[PDB]
Design a protein around this ligand. Structure first.
Ligand SMILES: [Fe+2]
Ligand SMILES: [Fe+2]
Ligand SMILES: [Fe+2]
Ligand SMILES: [Fe+2]
Lengths: 349, 349, 349, 349
């Protein structure tokens, strides 16, 4: 029950408004909910829709007229018109036209670029050029200069993933503009850092983000194959039966690629059904290859190559593989884990 | 410039709305600002207003009719009607009437209670009772059961500080209800942990929040006196000339009281003027004793005993002491520092 | 069995000697023992012997003729004439005569001074003077300048504890000579750092050793009393029944006083018998007050006020209290724990 | 000067001997030296001597008659007959005959096996078999079961490196005996862990030693080539001009292979002369390929393929390359660094 509605109570409340006071006893229960109840909702975007809308944006939106920023943000229908896939993460399909380029800038917001279709584009990160091709993860960690250049007449699509919404809501955003279009097969970073178990004596200092600028498909694919093969041979490897998986890591530390974003890659055997999880924080998956479905809040959605979906905080989810089902994954878990808010419920346990 | 406004462009945009896509090239620059530009604004609340409105709430709002929740939230005028002092922090004046009590609950949100006026109330934290009096900091770290009981006919006011707005925006909130009104002079926690330099062999495990339930005024006052005294004697101690200061810490670790909130206490000699700082993240100060002013965005506001004010992200601020000027401080810095978003500009350097 | 003893085998072995080769197959099993088998043996020194020999050293050994170095090293009878209490630790009774002084030096070896009898001596540590009295722990962490001065006509005895034998065997030793006899009641370090739960904003950097120069008896005694009192009240506190105990810690970190040495203080209720432990590494106890015994390798030795004893690596030990039994303790455990060699067996578990 | 040599002084000293007391004032200065002065001396072993003595041991010392332990320990001439290369490290040339095997054991002492000549031997580590060939580093971290099996009629030589002397002097040694001769091309460990930048979701827990059982030559060689190539292109990479180098690391952490031993591999361009270093702790190098010399204490020794040498604590050293000069390196630095005893002087700086 509320206080008696009296002229004195109404005078009290008008003083409140005047003095920027909001009394706790008037607040709606879910200021402190029983468990996380996001304004973001579970949502799927179909690739066939996204690619068609991206191609059209290629025609209608040239460089000089918005073409420098040709990226289709996935907007969660529960987040009020904000171009946010979740309360922490921005995810967009960047569509880079034949021969297009972008100049250098840096920003405090952390970012990756996961290559969906195409080849022969380079993203240049602190002057070091990083070739892009299908299945590759590129990082452009916060405060690193990044521009790019298409070396080809072909378009490319990648997922443009950032902590923009966290950074916007929390007031951490900074931004600077920057000041040869070399096309090396591999970046300096990779040439130093992508030898397993080995660390240059010139890079003995730990870093906050990975110095690996590209995690190439070859290696991702090979790691996942080896886990399934080790499973066949009776050896521990996979995380769950038929479920091979890796986390992309900062090799100086063994932890996440960047302070705010975790990236992983999963492969499921045909037939695999994962146990239902509730996890704090939001995650986004993209179907890289294969066919299957997701269950979110008990609702099953079938999924095809390229489809993308978001699980907001604490929404119970699982995946079923119809064929071999390869998925790229990102989430805000490093944030929940750094601050001791992370929590996990699994149907098995 | 934007793409040509054509029937095809308008069809593209209507497909966007239908498919929950928001194109980057339509977005307003400050999705990624040049430096943090908060929606929260610098604001001061006068104690004499807050105490008068609190007393009236005591009369008008009894237990059974909202009295269990008698706390006046400081609402930032730039945060849209949300009861948030800043985008990360909730700060409220809790007004506890003669003999009032509250039962036990726990929530994932972290919290402290800093005692402004009054005595002989106990907050009971995981069954351990913590006496409260003026100048004391109490913690109720996340997921710890806490209720309270006034043992007296006198009211008490404290600052009720939490990471509610971070927790609400980020989807990390959990909440449980709980299931003798002992009145020990000191808590078990204090009796184990408040011997300088000494650690019980039964508490060798590090914790995520401090096991000290109260940081009593005596010690705070004594530490600040010693720094000014060491300054008089030519010995390094104070942070800046005439500026004594402490941070409240988790003694198992030496770091912050809780994962999301930093607390500190400052004492300035009469005459002291601090150098202008820009810092990422928001901070709140309360004047504990003395007289002076603040400068925020170049605007000077005079301050009296009890006044409270907020500096949102990157707003340049400094303090001037007219008399000896004691201030309690909290901020979301452990969040900015954990995620490598923290940044500092000082006018000296 | 060994290789055939042939002229060719003997020629092989003479080539070995010539070329500084020692073949594994000739080595005695205990190059890699089944469990630690120290050359150091369990040993007790009686205080009444040590004090009598110390007094005589006071008469016979004046300043100018060895008096600057008047310290009686406890030499383990199994360590070959080396002045080592154990393979890692040096422990000596320093006997400081009326009005004696020592000038400043520093060395990489870490050291403490635990005051057995006497008062009004100061050890000056990086120019900061630290009063000494019975029951106090002083640190002189490695590479810190330290000299001292007796301000009185009375002698003082303290335990002079160092990692000298580790440092000597491992080749880490460095040593420098240094370049007012102030007598403050408390040191600068203490005045900054001995306020429970509080950390100066001017000392936000973690250190490798404690910045607390003295851990005074008052606080040690009070902590131990509180644990026994909390035990009386049914509250968890003591490590084992009737067994109160603390660890001295570096307050910036919550870990050990210095990188190589751990210090602790135990109080046992009359009647308390501890469960038998095997622990890797050596430890030394001193009886501060009370009466009881120790069991080492099944052999019981009765103990009086001032007695000192060493438990080398893996020797099973326990303590029995006849009266209330207060003991100071040091060990090389931070070394075994840092390098993942630590191991513990308890008779309970 | 010493105390007066009196009958009373002699009685004092006889009481000392009786009571296991050694007085400080009688001790020789270098109990606490000015800088490290090892009993170990700089020493070189020639490969042509070591291989010839190893072959002869193959003839004279069969299995059943010492052949199970056919390893030639490098004994430092200053370490008193102890089979120690330095005060912390044991280094031996293990010579494994045609078709020989060894059963499983484990010990707390940490160990590696760096393959000098030969192929088709497997060391089986916790049931997982690790093929061995020239240039490969294998680990058998402490407390891991390890046996081996030669699958061939050819002998193999490897460097058998351990922290035996530290473990022996410090009392940390434990040892257990253990209870198909599979010959996989690659180990399970490698198949999980040797994909650059990728970490199995099933191995998210950090470990104290590397889970990589072999660091194969291919990758080592490729990393060193890339650094010299990046040097040619004007890009930062090498540690010093013409000096390419890597550290072998634990991929869960980015730190050293094991708690007590660091391993590295250096490649110098023909002509390269390194600046003189003093470093705390001992190191051992082996010439893998090429020709050059070392300078230790100002004394130059020419070096050929296979030669091995030790630099004890603080001995100034440098390397000159005549040809391209590849060297494998191990040291006790993780011990000096963990305990804050490490120190470095370089002639450049
Ligand atoms: Fe960008
Ligand atoms: Fe609460
Ligand atoms: Fe000393
Ligand atoms: Fe072994």
């Amino acid at each position: 029950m509320q206080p008696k509605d009296t002229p004195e109570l109404r005078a009290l409340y008008k003083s409140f408004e005047e003095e920027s006071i909001i009394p706790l006893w008037t607040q709606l229960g879910d200021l402190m909910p029983i468990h996380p109840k996001s304004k973001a909702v579970p949502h799927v975007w179909k690739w066939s829709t996204l690619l068609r809308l991206a191609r059209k944006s290629g025609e209608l939106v040239p460089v000089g007229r918005g073409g420098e920023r040709r990226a289709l943000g996935l907007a969660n229908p529960g987040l009020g018109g904000n171009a946010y896939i979740s309360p922490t993460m921005w995810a967009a399909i960047q569509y880079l036209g034949p021969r297009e380029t972008a100049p250098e800038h840096r920003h405090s917001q952390n970012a990756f670029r996961f290559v969906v279709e195409g080849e022969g584009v380079w993203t240049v990160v602190n002057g070091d050029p990083v070739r892009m091709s299908r299945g590759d993860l590129l990082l452009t960690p916060g405060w690193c200069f990044h521009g790019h250049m298409n070396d080809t007449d072909q378009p490319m699509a990648w997922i443009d993933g950032l902590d923009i919404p966290f950074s916007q809501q929390m007031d951490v955003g900074f931004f600077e503009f920057g000041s040869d279009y070399a096309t090396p097969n591999f970046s300096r970073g990779e040439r130093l850092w992508c030898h397993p178990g080995l660390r240059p004596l010139s890079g003995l200092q730990n870093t906050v983000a990975s110095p690996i600028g590209a995690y190439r498909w070859e290696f991702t694919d090979r790691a996942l194959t080896e886990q399934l093969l080790l499973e066949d041979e009776g050896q521990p490897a996979t995380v769950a039966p038929g479920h091979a998986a890796i986390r992309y890591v900062n090799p100086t530390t063994g932890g996440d690629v960047m302070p705010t974003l975790r990236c992983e890659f999963h492969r499921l055997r045909a037939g695999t059904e994962t146990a239902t999880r509730n996890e704090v924080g939001s995650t986004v998956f993209q179907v890289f290859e294969g066919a299957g479905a997701v269950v979110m809040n008990g609702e099953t959605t079938k999924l095809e190559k390229g489809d993308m979906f978001v699980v907001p905080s604490w929404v119970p989810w699982s995946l079923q593989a119809e064929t071999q089902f390869d998925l790229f994954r990102f989430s805000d878990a490093p944030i929940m884990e750094a601050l001791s808010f992370m929590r996990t419920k699994i149907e098995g346990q």
